[PDB]
Short mmCIF file of C-alpha atoms and ligand atoms in Angstrom, two decimals:
data_model
loop_
_atom_site.label_atom_id
_atom_site.label_comp_id
_atom_site.label_asym_id
_atom_site.label_seq_id
_atom_site.Cartn_x
_atom_site.Cartn_y
_atom_site.Cartn_z
CA UNK P 1 -0.18 0.37 -0.35
CA UNK P 2 1.51 3.44 -0.97
CA UNK P 3 2.05 5.98 1.39
CA UNK P 4 1.76 8.54 -0.33
CA UNK P 5 -2.61 7.98 -1.55
CA UNK P 6 -3.19 9.30 2.20
CA UNK P 7 -3.69 12.39 2.86
CA UNK P 8 -3.65 13.98 7.48
CA UNK P 9 -6.52 16.40 7.37
CA UNK P 10 -6.74 16.93 10.82
CA UNK P 11 -4.02 15.10 13.73
CA UNK P 12 -5.01 14.71 17.10
CA UNK P 13 -5.28 11.60 20.19
CA UNK P 14 -6.21 8.12 18.58
CA UNK P 15 -9.37 6.65 20.36
CA UNK P 16 -10.13 2.99 21.29
CA UNK P 17 -12.93 2.51 19.30
CA UNK P 18 -13.50 1.59 15.48
CA UNK P 19 -12.24 2.99 12.82
CA UNK P 20 -15.08 5.15 10.69
CA UNK P 21 -14.85 5.60 7.18
CA UNK P 22 -17.12 8.67 6.17
CA UNK P 23 -17.74 6.63 2.88
CA UNK P 24 -19.01 9.75 -0.27
CA UNK P 25 -17.49 9.66 -3.32
CA UNK P 26 -16.43 6.02 -3.59
CA UNK P 27 -19.27 3.43 -2.62
CA UNK P 28 -17.51 0.04 -3.98
CA UNK P 29 -16.21 -2.90 -2.09
CA UNK P 30 -14.30 -3.79 -4.16
CA UNK P 31 -11.24 -1.21 -5.27
CA UNK P 32 -11.47 1.05 -2.76
CA UNK P 33 -8.58 2.30 -1.87
CA UNK P 34 -9.88 4.18 1.78
CA UNK P 35 -11.55 1.19 2.93
CA UNK P 36 -8.82 -0.98 2.28
CA UNK P 37 -6.55 2.13 4.26
CA UNK P 38 -9.25 2.13 6.91
CA UNK P 39 -8.76 -2.12 7.14
CA UNK P 40 -5.40 -1.58 7.85
CA UNK P 41 -5.32 0.34 10.60
CA UNK P 42 -8.01 -0.91 12.06
CA UNK P 43 -6.13 -4.33 12.20
CA UNK P 44 -2.70 -2.47 13.50
CA UNK P 45 -5.17 -0.63 16.42
CA UNK P 46 -6.94 -4.25 17.31
CA UNK P 47 -10.09 -2.63 16.66
CA UNK P 48 -13.17 -3.24 13.28
CA UNK P 49 -14.06 -1.32 11.00
CA UNK P 50 -16.96 0.53 9.78
CA UNK P 51 -18.39 2.38 6.85
CA UNK P 52 -20.27 5.66 7.73
CA UNK P 53 -22.77 7.09 4.49
CA UNK P 54 -23.62 10.87 5.08
CA UNK P 55 -27.46 11.01 2.99
CA UNK P 56 -26.72 14.45 2.53
CA UNK P 57 -29.65 17.00 2.42
CA UNK P 58 -28.93 18.44 -0.68
CA UNK P 59 -30.75 15.09 -2.79
CA UNK P 60 -33.82 17.56 -3.86
CA UNK P 61 -30.98 19.76 -5.91
CA UNK P 62 -31.12 16.85 -8.41
CA UNK P 63 -33.82 14.30 -10.16
CA UNK P 64 -34.81 10.54 -8.78
CA UNK P 65 -32.46 9.30 -11.57
CA UNK P 66 -29.22 9.99 -9.36
CA UNK P 67 -31.26 9.04 -6.23
CA UNK P 68 -32.03 5.71 -7.45
CA UNK P 69 -28.69 5.00 -8.67
CA UNK P 70 -26.76 5.69 -5.80
CA UNK P 71 -29.75 3.98 -3.40
CA UNK P 72 -29.88 0.55 -5.61
CA UNK P 73 -25.66 0.40 -4.67
CA UNK P 74 -26.13 0.78 -1.80
CA UNK P 75 -28.60 -1.93 -1.13
CA UNK P 76 -26.14 -4.12 -2.90
CA UNK P 77 -23.37 -2.54 -0.93
CA UNK P 78 -25.04 -3.08 2.05
CA UNK P 79 -24.94 -7.09 1.59
CA UNK P 80 -21.02 -7.34 0.54
CA UNK P 81 -19.93 -5.29 3.19
CA UNK P 82 -21.83 -7.42 5.89
CA UNK P 83 -20.32 -10.72 3.97
CA UNK P 84 -17.00 -9.24 4.69
CA UNK P 85 -18.40 -8.45 8.72
CA UNK P 86 -17.95 -4.55 8.19
CA UNK P 87 -21.40 -3.12 9.34
CA UNK P 88 -23.20 -0.13 7.64
CA UNK P 89 -24.72 3.24 9.03
CA UNK P 90 -26.45 5.63 6.76
CA UNK P 91 -26.98 8.50 8.37
CA UNK P 92 -29.39 11.74 7.33
CA UNK P 93 -28.37 15.21 7.50
CA UNK P 94 -26.10 17.03 7.31
CA UNK P 95 -23.15 15.24 7.60
CA UNK P 96 -20.87 18.12 10.17
CA UNK P 97 -24.05 17.30 12.80
CA UNK P 98 -24.27 13.94 11.87
CA UNK P 99 -20.00 12.44 11.64
CA UNK P 100 -19.39 14.44 14.59
CA UNK P 101 -21.82 12.74 16.38
CA UNK P 102 -21.39 9.55 15.57
CA UNK P 103 -17.82 9.94 16.17
CA UNK P 104 -18.80 10.91 19.59
CA UNK P 105 -21.93 8.29 20.34
CA UNK P 106 -19.45 5.33 18.87
CA UNK P 107 -15.83 6.34 20.56
CA UNK P 108 -14.43 6.36 16.98
CA UNK P 109 -10.74 6.58 16.86
CA UNK P 110 -9.96 7.22 13.81
CA UNK P 111 -11.98 8.36 10.43
CA UNK P 112 -11.35 8.14 7.10
CA UNK P 113 -13.08 9.62 4.04
CA UNK P 114 -12.49 9.13 0.08
CA UNK P 115 -10.62 12.78 -1.77
CA UNK P 116 -13.43 15.24 -3.63
CA UNK P 117 -12.27 18.25 -5.33
CA UNK P 118 -16.11 19.79 -5.37
CA UNK P 119 -16.86 23.02 -3.04
CA UNK P 120 -19.54 20.60 -1.27
CA UNK P 121 -16.85 17.97 -0.12
CA UNK P 122 -14.98 20.60 1.12
CA UNK P 123 -17.36 22.65 3.43
CA UNK P 124 -18.23 19.17 4.80
CA UNK P 125 -14.61 18.62 5.89
CA UNK P 126 -14.89 21.80 7.35
CA UNK P 127 -17.93 21.49 9.34
CA UNK P 128 -16.08 18.11 10.67
CA UNK P 129 -12.71 19.10 11.69
CA UNK P 130 -13.93 21.53 13.60
CA UNK P 131 -16.21 19.01 15.78
CA UNK P 132 -13.94 16.40 16.25
CA UNK P 133 -10.97 15.16 18.02
CA UNK P 134 -9.63 12.09 16.63
CA UNK P 135 -7.17 11.70 13.80
CA UNK P 136 -8.47 12.84 10.37
CA UNK P 137 -7.35 11.50 7.57
CA UNK P 138 -8.53 11.10 3.91
CA UNK P 139 -7.44 9.32 0.69
CA UNK P 140 -7.57 9.47 -2.90
CA UNK P 141 -9.43 5.99 -4.31
CA UNK P 142 -10.74 7.45 -7.01
CA UNK P 143 -7.49 7.96 -9.00
CA UNK P 144 -5.10 5.90 -9.59
CA UNK P 145 -2.24 8.54 -9.16
CA UNK P 146 -3.62 10.80 -5.92
CA UNK P 147 -4.39 13.96 -7.43
CA UNK P 148 -2.01 15.78 -4.67
CA UNK P 149 0.85 13.71 -6.41
CA UNK P 150 0.15 14.11 -10.47
CA UNK P 151 0.76 17.75 -10.47
CA UNK P 152 1.81 20.40 -7.60
CA UNK P 153 -0.26 23.21 -9.37
CA UNK P 154 -2.93 23.53 -13.05
CA UNK P 155 -1.93 21.84 -15.75
CA UNK P 156 -3.06 24.27 -18.45
CA UNK P 157 -3.71 21.91 -21.45
CA UNK P 158 -4.05 17.91 -21.67
CA UNK P 159 -0.17 17.37 -23.63
CA UNK P 160 1.41 19.33 -20.34
CA UNK P 161 -0.35 17.17 -17.74
CA UNK P 162 -0.06 13.98 -19.98
CA UNK P 163 3.44 13.12 -19.32
CA UNK P 164 2.87 13.78 -15.68
CA UNK P 165 1.01 10.77 -15.49
CA UNK P 166 1.76 8.30 -17.61
CA UNK P 167 5.74 8.65 -15.56
CA UNK P 168 3.90 8.11 -12.56
CA UNK P 169 1.85 5.22 -13.77
CA UNK P 170 4.60 2.64 -12.75
CA UNK P 171 4.29 3.61 -9.20
CA UNK P 172 0.25 4.28 -8.93
CA UNK P 173 -1.48 1.35 -11.64
CA UNK P 174 -0.74 -1.53 -9.40
CA UNK P 175 -3.44 -4.41 -8.42
CA UNK P 176 -5.91 -4.36 -5.07
CA UNK P 177 -5.19 -6.39 -2.13
CA UNK P 178 -7.76 -8.29 -1.12
CA UNK P 179 -10.48 -6.64 1.83
CA UNK P 180 -10.07 -8.74 4.23
CA UNK P 181 -12.59 -9.08 6.49
CA UNK P 182 -13.31 -8.70 9.78
CA UNK P 183 -11.81 -10.77 12.76
CA UNK P 184 -15.40 -10.58 14.73
CA UNK P 185 -18.89 -8.86 14.48
CA UNK P 186 -18.89 -5.63 15.83
CA UNK P 187 -21.98 -3.50 18.07
CA UNK P 188 -30.45 5.52 11.09
CA UNK P 189 -32.85 3.16 9.07
CA UNK P 190 -34.22 0.92 6.30
CA UNK P 191 -32.54 2.67 3.01
CA UNK P 192 -35.96 0.81 1.51
CA UNK P 193 -38.25 3.39 3.76
CA UNK P 194 -35.40 6.63 3.00
CA UNK P 195 -35.99 5.45 -1.32
CA UNK P 196 -39.11 5.46 -0.97
CA UNK P 197 -39.68 9.45 1.50
CA UNK P 198 -36.50 10.17 -0.78
CA UNK P 199 -38.26 9.60 -3.88
CA UNK P 200 -41.59 10.95 -2.58
CA UNK P 201 -40.62 13.98 -1.98
CA UNK P 202 -38.53 14.18 -5.53
CA UNK P 203 -42.26 13.17 -7.57
CA UNK P 204 -43.62 17.02 -7.66
CA UNK P 205 -40.50 17.84 -9.35
CA UNK P 206 -39.89 15.09 -12.17
CA UNK P 207 -38.98 15.00 -15.87
CA UNK P 208 -42.36 14.82 -17.15
CA UNK P 209 -43.58 14.94 -21.00
CA UNK P 210 -47.30 16.01 -22.10
CA UNK P 211 -48.59 12.95 -21.40
CA UNK P 212 -48.03 13.17 -17.40
CA UNK P 213 -45.36 9.99 -18.21
CA UNK P 214 -42.16 10.44 -16.98
CA UNK P 215 -39.33 11.18 -19.23
CA UNK P 216 -36.63 9.10 -17.92
CA UNK P 217 -36.17 5.90 -19.08
CA UNK P 218 -34.75 3.45 -15.73
CA UNK P 219 -33.54 0.36 -18.02
CA UNK P 220 -30.21 1.46 -19.80
CA UNK P 221 -28.11 1.76 -16.38
CA UNK P 222 -28.76 -1.28 -14.26
CA UNK P 223 -27.35 0.29 -10.22
CA UNK P 224 -24.59 -2.18 -7.98
CA UNK P 225 -21.61 -3.49 -8.59
CA UNK P 226 -22.00 -5.89 -10.07
CA UNK P 227 -23.69 -4.27 -13.34
CA UNK P 228 -20.76 -1.85 -13.31
CA UNK P 229 -18.17 -4.86 -14.05
CA UNK P 230 -20.57 -6.51 -16.51
CA UNK P 231 -20.74 -3.36 -18.70
CA UNK P 232 -16.83 -3.13 -18.07
CA UNK P 233 -16.23 -6.55 -19.00
CA UNK P 234 -19.26 -5.54 -22.38
CA UNK P 235 -17.24 -2.79 -23.47
CA UNK P 236 -13.75 -4.95 -23.10
CA UNK P 237 -14.25 -7.76 -25.36
CA UNK P 238 -17.28 -5.76 -27.68
CA UNK P 239 -16.84 -1.73 -27.63
CA UNK P 240 -12.83 -1.79 -27.38
CA UNK P 241 -12.05 -2.47 -31.00
CA UNK P 242 -13.82 -0.29 -32.67
CA UNK P 243 -13.99 2.65 -29.74
CA UNK P 244 -11.25 3.99 -31.37
CA UNK P 245 -12.96 5.02 -34.43
CA UNK P 246 -16.33 5.09 -33.21
CA UNK P 247 -16.06 7.72 -30.47
CA UNK P 248 -17.01 10.50 -32.32
CA UNK P 249 -20.34 8.49 -33.73
CA UNK P 250 -23.57 9.78 -31.06
CA UNK P 251 -24.91 7.22 -33.73
CA UNK P 252 -23.30 3.97 -32.59
CA UNK P 253 -24.10 3.21 -28.84
CA UNK P 254 -19.78 2.46 -29.18
CA UNK P 255 -19.06 4.24 -25.60
CA UNK P 256 -18.01 2.37 -22.68
CA UNK P 257 -21.09 3.48 -20.85
CA UNK P 258 -18.84 3.06 -17.03
CA UNK P 259 -19.25 6.85 -15.93
CA UNK P 260 -22.17 6.41 -13.51
CA UNK P 261 -20.64 3.80 -12.18
CA UNK P 262 -17.35 5.90 -12.23
CA UNK P 263 -18.88 8.90 -11.09
CA UNK P 264 -20.71 7.25 -7.69
CA UNK P 265 -17.88 5.61 -7.12
CA UNK P 266 -19.20 1.38 -8.47
CA UNK P 267 -16.16 0.81 -9.81
CA UNK P 268 -12.89 1.52 -10.04
CA UNK P 269 -11.31 3.74 -13.07
CA UNK P 270 -7.90 1.66 -11.90
CA UNK P 271 -9.72 -2.30 -12.12
CA UNK P 272 -10.41 -0.58 -16.00
CA UNK P 273 -7.00 0.43 -16.56
CA UNK P 274 -6.39 -2.87 -15.32
CA UNK P 275 -8.45 -5.24 -17.13
CA UNK P 276 -7.45 -2.73 -20.75
CA UNK P 277 -3.86 -2.90 -20.53
CA UNK P 278 -3.85 -6.69 -20.48
CA UNK P 279 -5.73 -6.67 -23.37
CA UNK P 280 -5.15 -7.64 -26.94
CA UNK P 281 -6.98 -5.15 -28.75
CA UNK P 282 -6.76 -1.95 -31.49
CA UNK P 283 -3.62 0.25 -30.10
CA UNK P 284 -4.96 2.95 -31.48
CA UNK P 285 -8.30 2.42 -29.65
CA UNK P 286 -6.63 1.87 -26.20
CA UNK P 287 -4.75 4.22 -25.92
CA UNK P 288 -7.81 7.01 -27.32
CA UNK P 289 -9.45 5.53 -24.51
CA UNK P 290 -6.55 5.54 -21.80
CA UNK P 291 -6.10 9.06 -22.30
CA UNK P 292 -9.73 9.56 -21.98
CA UNK P 293 -9.77 7.45 -18.70
CA UNK P 294 -6.27 8.59 -16.92
CA UNK P 295 -5.53 11.99 -18.63
CA UNK P 296 -9.73 13.53 -18.99
CA UNK P 297 -10.43 12.38 -16.42
CA UNK P 298 -8.09 12.33 -13.63
CA UNK P 299 -7.31 16.59 -15.08
CA UNK P 300 -10.80 17.04 -13.55
CA UNK P 301 -9.54 16.50 -10.80
CA UNK P 302 -6.62 18.89 -10.91
CA UNK P 303 -8.72 21.72 -11.92
CA UNK P 304 -11.50 20.82 -8.99
CA UNK P 305 -8.71 20.96 -6.79
CA UNK P 306 -6.34 23.42 -8.17
CA UNK P 307 -8.71 26.33 -8.89
CA UNK P 308 -11.72 27.59 -6.10
CA UNK P 309 -13.81 28.92 -8.63
CA UNK P 310 -13.96 26.01 -10.75
CA UNK P 311 -17.73 26.89 -11.52
CA UNK P 312 -16.79 30.43 -12.38
CA UNK P 313 -15.62 32.84 -15.01
CA UNK P 314 -12.67 33.79 -13.66
CA UNK P 315 -10.89 29.67 -14.04
CA UNK P 316 -11.32 30.65 -17.54
CA UNK P 317 -7.64 31.21 -19.01
CA UNK P 318 -6.30 34.76 -19.79
CA UNK P 319 -7.00 34.83 -23.56
CA UNK P 320 -10.53 33.54 -23.46
CA UNK P 321 -11.31 35.77 -21.07
CA UNK P 322 -10.13 38.37 -22.63
CA UNK P 323 -11.86 37.54 -26.31
CA UNK P 324 -15.32 36.73 -24.21
CA UNK P 325 -14.94 40.57 -22.64
CA UNK P 326 -14.38 41.60 -26.50
CA UNK P 327 -17.67 39.89 -27.30
CA UNK P 328 -19.76 40.21 -24.49
CA UNK P 329 -22.07 43.70 -26.35
CA UNK P 330 -21.95 41.92 -30.01
CA UNK P 331 -25.62 40.84 -31.06
CA UNK P 332 -26.55 37.38 -30.17
CA UNK P 333 -28.05 35.54 -33.14
CA UNK P 334 -31.20 33.84 -30.63
CA UNK P 335 -31.36 34.16 -27.00
CA UNK P 336 -33.46 31.80 -25.42
CA UNK P 337 -34.41 30.71 -21.20
CA UNK P 338 -33.55 27.99 -19.11
CA UNK P 339 -36.43 26.66 -19.37
CA UNK P 340 -37.03 26.60 -22.69
CA UNK P 341 -33.32 24.77 -22.81
CA UNK P 342 -34.38 22.72 -20.74
CA UNK P 343 -37.68 22.04 -22.75
CA UNK P 344 -35.29 21.40 -25.53
CA UNK P 345 -37.03 24.71 -27.85
CA UNK P 346 -34.49 26.00 -30.09
CA UNK P 347 -34.37 26.24 -33.93
CA UNK P 348 -31.69 23.62 -34.10
CA UNK P 349 -33.06 19.90 -33.76
CA UNK P 350 -29.20 18.52 -33.23
CA UNK P 351 -29.17 20.78 -29.83
CA UNK P 352 -33.21 19.58 -29.46
CA UNK P 353 -32.32 15.96 -30.43
CA UNK P 354 -29.54 16.27 -27.44
CA UNK P 355 -31.23 17.32 -25.49
CA UNK P 356 -33.51 15.26 -25.17
CA UNK P 357 -31.61 12.48 -25.16
CA UNK P 358 -29.95 14.18 -21.47
CA UNK P 359 -34.04 14.21 -20.36
CA UNK P 360 -34.64 10.27 -21.24
CA UNK P 361 -31.49 8.96 -21.42
CA UNK P 362 -30.33 10.92 -18.83
CA UNK P 363 -26.64 10.13 -20.13
CA UNK P 364 -25.69 11.87 -23.33
CA UNK P 365 -23.40 11.22 -25.27
CA UNK P 366 -19.40 12.56 -25.28
CA UNK P 367 -19.57 13.90 -28.57
CA UNK P 368 -22.74 15.98 -28.64
CA UNK P 369 -22.05 17.55 -25.23
CA UNK P 370 -19.65 19.67 -26.57
CA UNK P 371 -21.59 20.77 -29.68
CA UNK P 372 -24.23 21.08 -26.65
CA UNK P 373 -22.78 23.08 -23.81
CA UNK P 374 -21.17 25.39 -26.63
CA UNK P 375 -24.54 26.46 -28.09
CA UNK P 376 -25.61 27.14 -24.67
CA UNK P 377 -22.86 29.61 -24.66
CA UNK P 378 -23.91 31.18 -28.31
CA UNK P 379 -27.54 31.67 -27.61
CA UNK P 380 -27.00 33.15 -23.60
CA UNK P 381 -26.75 36.89 -22.56
CA UNK P 382 -23.35 36.56 -21.01
CA UNK P 383 -20.82 33.68 -20.34
CA UNK P 384 -21.85 33.85 -17.14
CA UNK P 385 -25.49 32.90 -17.53
CA UNK P 386 -24.02 30.62 -19.87
CA UNK P 387 -22.01 28.59 -16.89
CA UNK P 388 -25.26 28.74 -14.95
CA UNK P 389 -27.15 26.68 -18.23
CA UNK P 390 -24.48 24.49 -19.09
CA UNK P 391 -24.62 23.57 -14.74
CA UNK P 392 -27.48 23.20 -13.17
CA UNK P 393 -28.74 20.94 -17.21
CA UNK P 394 -25.53 19.51 -16.80
CA UNK P 395 -25.66 18.54 -12.67
CA UNK P 396 -29.59 17.88 -12.87
CA UNK P 397 -30.06 15.32 -15.73
CA UNK P 398 -26.89 13.32 -16.35
CA UNK P 399 -26.41 10.28 -13.97
CA UNK P 400 -22.61 11.37 -14.36
CA UNK P 401 -23.20 15.06 -12.95
CA UNK P 402 -22.10 16.45 -10.15
CA UNK P 403 -19.08 15.76 -10.51
CA UNK P 404 -15.27 16.80 -11.93
CA UNK P 405 -15.13 15.66 -14.99
CA UNK P 406 -18.82 17.89 -16.02
CA UNK P 407 -17.25 21.06 -15.18
CA UNK P 408 -14.07 20.45 -16.63
CA UNK P 409 -15.67 19.22 -20.05
CA UNK P 410 -17.95 22.73 -18.98
CA UNK P 411 -15.08 25.11 -18.76
CA UNK P 412 -13.61 23.23 -22.14
CA UNK P 413 -16.74 24.24 -24.19
CA UNK P 414 -17.14 27.87 -22.98
CA UNK P 415 -14.05 28.69 -20.93
CA UNK P 416 -12.00 26.56 -23.35
CA UNK P 417 -10.12 25.13 -20.27
CA UNK P 418 -7.42 22.86 -21.62
CA UNK P 419 -7.76 23.65 -25.29
CA UNK P 420 -6.66 26.43 -27.38
CA UNK P 421 -7.23 29.82 -29.31
CA UNK P 422 -9.47 28.83 -32.57
CA UNK P 423 -10.37 31.18 -35.10
CA UNK P 424 -12.05 34.91 -33.43
CA UNK P 425 -15.67 34.48 -34.99
CA UNK P 426 -18.30 37.16 -33.11
CA UNK P 427 -20.03 36.06 -29.98
CA UNK P 428 -18.38 33.18 -29.25
CA UNK P 429 -14.49 34.94 -30.03
CA UNK P 430 -11.74 32.39 -30.22
CA UNK P 431 -13.60 29.81 -28.40
CA UNK P 432 -13.15 26.96 -30.37
CA UNK P 433 -16.56 26.68 -32.89
CA UNK P 434 -19.04 23.52 -33.54
CA UNK P 435 -21.65 24.07 -36.30
CA UNK P 436 -24.57 22.49 -37.32
CA UNK P 437 -23.07 21.56 -41.45
CA UNK P 438 -19.68 20.16 -38.90
CA UNK P 439 -22.04 17.38 -37.50
CA UNK P 440 -22.79 16.52 -40.80
CA UNK P 441 -20.03 16.30 -41.75
CA UNK P 442 -19.01 14.01 -39.63
CA UNK P 443 -21.94 11.37 -38.25
CA UNK P 444 -25.62 11.03 -40.07
CA UNK P 445 -27.47 13.98 -37.69
CA UNK P 446 -30.78 13.35 -39.17
CA UNK P 447 -30.70 8.98 -37.33
CA UNK P 448 -29.36 10.70 -34.47
CA UNK P 449 -33.12 13.47 -34.42
CA UNK P 450 -34.99 11.04 -34.93
CA UNK P 451 -33.63 8.83 -32.51
CA UNK P 452 -34.74 10.86 -29.44
CA UNK P 453 -38.14 12.25 -31.28
C1 FAD L 1 -20.11 19.64 -21.85
C2 FAD L 1 -20.27 18.34 -20.82
C3 FAD L 1 -20.61 17.66 -19.59
C4 FAD L 1 -20.34 16.90 -19.11
N1 FAD L 1 -21.19 16.10 -18.59
C5 FAD L 1 -20.38 15.28 -17.51
C6 FAD L 1 -20.73 15.39 -16.03
O1 FAD L 1 -21.87 14.83 -15.31
N2 FAD L 1 -20.25 13.40 -16.11
C7 FAD L 1 -19.42 13.64 -15.90
O2 FAD L 1 -18.89 12.38 -15.55
N3 FAD L 1 -18.73 13.36 -17.25
C8 FAD L 1 -19.24 15.02 -18.04
N4 FAD L 1 -18.39 14.70 -19.32
C9 FAD L 1 -17.50 14.49 -19.75
C10 FAD L 1 -17.54 12.96 -20.83
O3 FAD L 1 -18.92 14.21 -21.32
C11 FAD L 1 -18.67 11.86 -20.34
O4 FAD L 1 -17.38 11.76 -19.17
C12 FAD L 1 -19.33 10.88 -21.32
O5 FAD L 1 -19.32 10.68 -21.71
C13 FAD L 1 -18.75 9.33 -20.01
O6 FAD L 1 -20.00 8.80 -20.80
P1 FAD L 1 -18.70 7.25 -21.39
O7 FAD L 1 -18.43 6.53 -20.44
O8 FAD L 1 -20.47 5.97 -22.09
O9 FAD L 1 -17.60 7.88 -22.44
P2 FAD L 1 -16.20 7.13 -22.08
O10 FAD L 1 -15.21 7.78 -23.76
O11 FAD L 1 -15.85 5.22 -22.50
O12 FAD L 1 -15.00 7.78 -21.14
C14 FAD L 1 -15.22 6.78 -19.64
C15 FAD L 1 -14.43 7.71 -19.52
O13 FAD L 1 -13.41 8.22 -19.55
C16 FAD L 1 -13.69 9.96 -18.50
N5 FAD L 1 -13.93 10.62 -19.42
C17 FAD L 1 -14.31 10.12 -21.11
N6 FAD L 1 -14.20 11.31 -21.72
C18 FAD L 1 -14.38 12.30 -20.51
C19 FAD L 1 -14.52 13.55 -20.67
N7 FAD L 1 -14.20 14.70 -22.01
N8 FAD L 1 -13.83 14.20 -19.61
C20 FAD L 1 -13.95 14.11 -18.20
N9 FAD L 1 -13.70 12.67 -18.54
C21 FAD L 1 -13.92 12.20 -19.67
C22 FAD L 1 -15.07 9.35 -18.39
O14 FAD L 1 -14.79 9.01 -16.64
C23 FAD L 1 -15.00 8.38 -18.62
O15 FAD L 1 -16.82 8.09 -17.32
C24 FAD L 1 -19.31 16.12 -19.56
C25 FAD L 1 -18.33 17.24 -21.21
C26 FAD L 1 -18.94 17.41 -21.28
C27 FAD L 1 -18.28 18.56 -22.51
#
């Protein structure tokens, strides 16, 4: 176990009680460095290890599609942890008041949590640190290389972060040891009841069409840690060979579809890299997939970690902020509201079809996501309004929303983060421009539109 994967958030006196794992971002039993580190510390202290998940009050800022996917994965996760003699306690309320109360009530000795660069995660840490007296650690179980170890500053481009990540691969890209069960079973409600009351409070704000029927289709992605492995095996055996040539074709389902499992942490990205690296397929397709799940994925955590205002206009590069400021007073072709973008009532059938896929499946195609966000910038009153509309529609209907990948992706499409300066156009400026005629020459837009009516 590499000691570089774990950071110390707060020092203090260690108690004689069970080591608590505050699971937030990585909801899985296998390939969880934070869970493995908690077990190792528990073994050395001759005490059991426990897992504590907090059902925060911000679940109403999302939809049922993200609430059911996460909770139904925990129901399978609770059974798996119980088979390892590891109890799980699901708390409802503020993490600042629930974690600090659980530590005091159960005489916790050491508190461990997974790493997350999001602002909401840092808000909870500030509350938890102020109310605990036991050692506090955090472990990066999401990225293959720890976020603080890949780079010590903000990487403005992928070609500068790629050499730093690949050079650290021989040290951190390794196999996961078996999660040892607890020696004995140690000494706040049913998840089924939490899902029933949670959905009931989310029914009035459910996405529906004119016929009062739901828009979301839950049969596309089955939640759970077992289902994530089945999808990963399907991609390597069926879609990995043609991934490098059909990644930019929205009409073909040639993607891995691992993001909803990678977002909630139901499957480890390092596990996906290990299986792909030992798989024999097209070298140009493996390189394309490795560049997306390692470079572009972990650079999204580098963006949110080394930029506090990652969701603001100030995190954009200097060239993009000056170019957008020089085209603020340009007459936009169209100005749509948030309700018009949400309902897909624009003049672009390609953009509307992209939005419908977001509403129905909850996972828009990787290529169309770049087009869907750049048209928001072109059809908004200001770049600040484009950021809010893109972030809102992303975190609300994307099954992988509220993730550093989304914020880095939105900042790339609107502010050109991790991008270069292109030809200077009106309104958009030097930000990379994507046209409807450009997509027609790239893929069959007629089939993509006709699929999502
Ligand atoms: C405007 C916009 C919004 C986005 N919204 C989200 C979002 O809400 N949540 C989210 O997790 N990702 C988001 N992304 C990144 C990307 O679109 C998705 O991660 C990708 O579509 C995931 O689906 P997939 O696994 O089938 O694609 P794949 O090509 O099979 O990629 C597999 C994994 O590689 C990573 N990856 C691939 N492409 C990217 C990328 N462009 N940026 C970062 N990581 C990547 C992801 O971890 C992904 O799960 C967004 C990108 C843009 C441009």
